[PDB]
Ligand code: HEM
């Protein structure tokens with residue numbers, strides 16, 4: 289019998305790092321803001337496929353971020369690590385979400401982020417220096433794209449960069465984990481590490497956010513010890529994994545559009561605009577749109593019922609032709625305003641301006657010091673991560689003009 293169904297499987301995997309998976313360009317094109325899909329466990333779910341609708345549902349208080357709910361749309365087995373663990377505030381709803389988030393925000397304001405610019409410039413050129421000096425060829429992942437945000441986020445959290453090999457490895461295993469067993473074991477490695485850091489900080493008040501949370505909120509019983517572990521773990525992995533994939537994918541992508549890059553290299557006033565457009569275009573975290581309805585919601589004559597799962601896929605909504613003229617075209621000159629790569633509403637990405645700062649420093653730095661950077665394999669040979677985790681390559685060999 290024909291095989292066509294009205295709720296395709298979800299998610300799909302990318303095949304060119306900067307293009308929607310075929311199955312996603314479909315859903316984008318169907319009229320209507322909501323489409324049915326089938327998740328890995330045969331349950332059926334709603335995906336939002338339009339910009340204004342995504343924007344409205346992300347602001348709607350009837351869509352919960354509670355991941356311990358049995359109807360939360362888990363997209364992979366690995367997910368049931370985070371489901372059964374104490375929740376960071378990304379899995380909380382108002383009013384709990386606010387009191388937890390408000391403990392971390394002092395370190396992420398525009399004032400604090402702006403003033404970090406000297407220190408971020410120092411880290412980047414530091415790791416380039418070392419990269420360049422060991423000569424081509426280089427894997428831009430392990431030698432640059434990953435170490436740079438790791439170092440920055442550690443100094444912010446107060447995690448010692450000495451232990452960098454341990455937690456980078458445990459973060460890798462946890463984002464890319466394909467089964468539940470591997471994800472839990474990565475989580476328990478990281479949690480056990482962080483629990484010892486907290487005791488160490490109870491003996492000697494540490495620096496960073498984690499030190500301040502130990503010495504203050506934990507000492508007064510306003511946060512559970514195990515909640516602290518989850519919060520620090522969220523910031524640590526998010527601090528690392530996202531900026532690094534942006535760096536690698538923005539590099540693959542900028543090279544396959546060499547006439548916009550040229551113009552980037554020639555007018556550094558455009559860099560903050562190309563950052564926005566890169567964020568819109570690449571949307572590395574389309575999974576981070578998971579919600580469950582706690583009530584019936586009406587959207588343009590379609591009905592989400594209490595208990596249904598809804599995935600706001602910000603990569604599709606960012607390719608909404610009625611907001612971005614020719615949406616599948618990378619245009620560093622376009623106005624990429626109102627994009628959803630960071631989300632919207634109360635869960636809007638806490639670290640977005642740190643992420644903008646890192647990318648804008650990193651790019652300038654790559655254009656000053658390796659203006660002849662190019663890839664050391666053809667793009668068709670890179671292994672892409674699957675659609676069940678954050679978008680990116682795991683390896684990126686590159687080369688340049690040696691001194
Ligand atoms: C670099 C590229 C990044 C992308 C594409 C990205 C994407 C996102 C998205 C889409 C959300 C929404 C989650 C939801 O609505 O359920 C989110 C939340 C969050 N992100 Fe980012 N993010 C990035 C960088 C960062 C960085 C550098 C940090 C460092 C701390 C960070 C920390 C967080 C936190 C704490 C939240 C949750 C805020 C809340 O739930 O109130 N992110 N991110």
Ligand SMILES: CC[C@H](C)C(=O)O[C@H]1CCC=C2C=C[C@H](C)[C@H](CC[C@@H](O)C[C@@H](O)CC(=O)O)[C@H]21
Pocket residue numbers: 366367370373374375376378462463464517518519521522525526529530573575576676677678
């Ligand atoms: C199953 C793969 C992972 C967990 C995933 O797809 O999401 C992670 C992977 C790395 C990038 C991410 C970016 C956006 C969000 C912060 C997202 C939410 C997941 C979060 O729940 C991870 C837990 O480790 C945090 C905790 O439970 O303390 C997070």
